Ligand binder design. Structure first.
Ligand code: B12
Ligand code: SF4
Length: 727
């Protein structure tokens, strides 16, 4: 009945617009819509597809199948196309409904396997969830291709191991997948143990696979305990597509995209992974978990590109994330952002997107990457409500003197468009302020280039954070630390938001690079270390990095053992434990870790109180955090001074101590032993005591308010009693 068809499509379009509902809830509303007339009886229904291609099949029986596609021309349906590549007329108006009569094989295509994907989480360490793209994009890929019914389970929202197993027994999946991230080995093994014990009991029958970086990097530890396990080495989309084909006996195991496995002869095999056509095959992440994420005050995410076109930083392994850059189209980027924002608004989640991209800006062979960003920004600026979004970028995505002035001026224009469209907290992978160390890091940048990048981005009103790895194991002598400290103390890098007014981009660019009076007029006066993400950080050497091979090459070249655990990496953390080739630098790195450990409880408590404090207490608690960061920066300057004094550092340290009334602060000069370094740090810790005595007095005076369990009182009391104790 054509009147009922129109009514059914219109009602389905309204049902399918609720893209946060899980497919079972969508199906419930579809059953209630089709049971609303006794003038139609059916045997079963199936919903597949997603967002703008969601599709309902009403199976009257296997010989009469109705198909409704309210959001897209049915001729583009991939399931129907696999069943019959010429079922439709190439020249007709778009069709949104079709009844298929006596199409026996079509029923088999509609018997979709079930795939359950589980995101693991150690909720103690990560209490605030973010939309999980690892599983969300695998789900949406499979739904859009109409390859499987997908169930999503996310431990971020509190689902326990026993609730996962209960869920699996109820859903009876054909494929179970776990996303296994840093620190999740023990959780993964516990869940896998229970999965296989229930397979053994006849309660489950499933292909089991694990993915993400931890099993990809260390498969042997997984194969040793679970010999039949299949590991997804890189992207999961085509892997899951091919496991579904293998389920149907349409592929052999040695044909499945991008997996590692133990074959019949007990040998580990690897299958080639074809890089996913991300541009157009991976839609909006599935939003099944979003409602629960909003209850935990969680965050929206999106990945608008995959990979890094640079891929040369020596500490950044590329084997899992790959060495080429694959962007979403502009149109698709804007559609997916619209979807996530609309769904977030339904749950009152604030319109703040955390971009997952390793490289948001990218590089294209035709050189149009900046225009792509400007087009995305122009699309965001057409929206009715403003948004904010965060992303990461290299310093040379801002400023690159090896490129023409015209390229850099167009780059500044692009960054301005990012600011206009809502770019908020941007992370720049500076990593070092020492030209030698930058080269050991494979960053390709100079110290001065990093300063200028920060100047340009901050002048646009964007709110920067930088990565900074102060210590690295191959550093010889103290020169690179002195260079780093000098860089971090520069006050000519961070600019206030500059009113562009009637300046051209070229005028703004020229003034920020060359006009010393202009830079002075507009600086915030804050040193670079104020935007460092993690102070006093030391290099953590991951598996499969150029830096690990540089260390292994130094072990041979200088006949010294640097990689502990008998050269073996940690499977759970995907990284080596490595000593420093320069024992003094190793001692300085160790002391800085002990400094961090010694302040962690009190500073964690101050940070926790700050999140929920009134405006006046918020500023007081923030001032403690600023002072702590300052004391932590000049701790290292003080340690280096006591090993290698110079007059310039003597003045700076004396000025700082005088500003804090600690000029008095059994110390050997030039002595790099652990014992002397600890004695020096015990002395500097008296400055931290001075800060915490102000915190203590403010707490006692009622100027700041403690938590209900008296956490600040308790951690302060312990801190004072632990002074000069190190471990
Ligand atoms: C958000 C994020 C975080 C958040 C995580 C929060 C959370 N609740 O998830 C925070 C800030 C805490 C974080 C911390 C760290 N991170 Co981080 N993080 C990211 C980021 C920016 C996005 C992750 C994402 O959404 N990716 C997009 C999804 C689609 O990719 P995916 O997870 O890899 O999933 C795909 C495949 O792995 C596969 N797959 C995944 N799961 C499964 C499951 C199955 C069954 C199958 C078949 C396939 C499969 O299919 C998916 C689709 O193709 C990535 C960069 C990136 N673009 O990946 C870095 C990144 C993953 N992080 C990285 C690192 C190094 C860290 C830290 C170790 C940093 C540090 N030194 O402290 C810590 C680790 C903390 C910890 N203990 O877990 C590195 C990983 C190493 C590498 N490959 O180079 C990355 C790549 C960034 C970088 N280049 O430095 N991180
Ligand atoms: S650190 Fe950043 S720029 Fe360097 S290879 Fe990794 S993702 Fe690319």
């Amino acid at each position: 009945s054509t009147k009922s068809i129109e009514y059914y499509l219109k009602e389905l379009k309204e049902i399918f617009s609720q893209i946060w509902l899980k497919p079972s809830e969508i199906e419930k509303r579809c059953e209630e819509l089709f049971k609303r007339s006794k003038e139609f009886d059916y045997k079963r229904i199936l919903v597949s597809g997603e967002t703008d291609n969601t599709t309902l099949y009403v199976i009257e029986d296997s010989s009469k199948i109705h198909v409704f596609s309210p959001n897209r021309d049915l001729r583009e349906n991939p399931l129907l196309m696999r069943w019959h590549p010429s079922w439709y007329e190439i020249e007709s108006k778009e069709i949104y409904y079709k009844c298929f009569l006596s199409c026996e094989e079509l029923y088999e295509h509609l018997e979709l396997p079930t795939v359950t994907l589980v995101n693991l989480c150690v909720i103690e360490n990560f209490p605030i969830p973010r939309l999980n793209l690892s599983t969300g994009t695998l789900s949406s890929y499979l739904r859009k291709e109409q390859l499987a019914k997908v169930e999503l389970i996310d431990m971020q929202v509190g689902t326990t191991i026993n609730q996962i197993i209960k869920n699996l027994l109820d859903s009876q999946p054909d494929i179970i997948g776990l996303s296994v991230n840093f620190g999740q080995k023990k959780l993964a093994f516990e869940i896998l143990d229970l999965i296989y014990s229930h397979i053994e009991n006849g309660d489950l029958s499933s292909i089991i696979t694990v993915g993400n970086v931890i099993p990809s990097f260390s498969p042997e530890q997984f194969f040793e305990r679970y010999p039949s396990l299949l590991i997804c080495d890189k992207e999961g989309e085509y892997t899951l597509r091919d496991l579904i084909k293998m389920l149907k006996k349409e592929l052999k195991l040695d044909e499945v995209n991008g997996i590692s496995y133990v074959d019949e002869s007990g040998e580990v095999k690897h299958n080639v992974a074809e890089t996913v056509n991300f541009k157009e095959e991976v839609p909006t992440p599935s939003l099944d978990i979003l409602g629960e994420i909003s209850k935990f005050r969680g965050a929206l995410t999106l990945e608008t590109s995959r990979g890094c076109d640079y891929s040369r930083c020596t500490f950044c392994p590329r084997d899992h994330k790959l060495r080429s850059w694959r962007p979403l189209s502009v149109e698709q980027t804007l559609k997916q952002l619209d979807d996530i924002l609309r769904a977030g608004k339904h749950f009152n989640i604030k319109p703040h997107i955390y971009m997952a991209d390793e490289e948001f800006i990218g590089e294209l062979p035709n050189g149009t990457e900046a225009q792509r960003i400007i087009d995305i920004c122009e699309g965001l600026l057409k929206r009715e409500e403003k948004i904010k979004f965060d992303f990461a970028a290299r310093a040379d995505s801002v400023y690159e003197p090896k490129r023409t002035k015209e390229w850099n001026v167009e780059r500044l224009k692009m960054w301005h468009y990012c600011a206009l469209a809502g770019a908020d907290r941007i992370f720049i992978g500076v990593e070092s302020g020492s030209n030698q160390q930058l080269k050991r890091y494979g960053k390709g940048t100079t110290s001065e280039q990093n300063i200028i990048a920060l100047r340009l981005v901050s002048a646009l009103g964007i709110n920067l954070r930088i990565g900074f790895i102060m210590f690295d194991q191959l550093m010889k002598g103290l020169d690179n630390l002195k260079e780093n400290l000098d860089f971090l103390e520069r006050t000519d890098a961070l600019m206030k938001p500059i009113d562009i007014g009637d300046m051209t981009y070229e005028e703004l660019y020229d003034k920020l690079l060359n006009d010393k009076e202009f830079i002075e007029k507009h600086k915030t006066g804050k040193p670079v270390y104020t935007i460092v993400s993690y102070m006093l950080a030391s290099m953590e050497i991951l598996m499969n990095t150029p830096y690990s091979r540089m260390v292994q090459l130094t072990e041979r070249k200088e006949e010294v053992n640097l990689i502990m655990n008998d050269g073996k990496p940690d499977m759970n953390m995907g990284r080596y434990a490595t000593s420093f080739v320069d024992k003094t630098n190793g001692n300085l790195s160790e002391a800085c870790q002990m400094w961090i450990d010694s302040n962690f409880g009190v500073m964690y408590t101050i940070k926790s109180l700050h999140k929920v404090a009134n405006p006046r207490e918020k500023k007081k608690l923030y001032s403690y955090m600023e002072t702590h960061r300052e004391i932590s920066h000049f701790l290292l300057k003080y340690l280096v001074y006591n090993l290698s004094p110079d007059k310039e550092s003597q003045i700076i340290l004396s000025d700082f101590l005088r500003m804090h009334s600690m000029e008095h602060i059994k110390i050997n000069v030039g002595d790099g032993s652990k014992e002397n370094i600890l004695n020096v740090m015990t002395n500097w810790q008296l400055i931290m005591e001075k800060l915490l005595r102000d915190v203590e007095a403010d707490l006692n005076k009622g100027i700041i308010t403690d938590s209900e369990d008296h956490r600040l009182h308790n951690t302060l009391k312990r801190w004072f009693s632990d002074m000069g104790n190190w471990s």
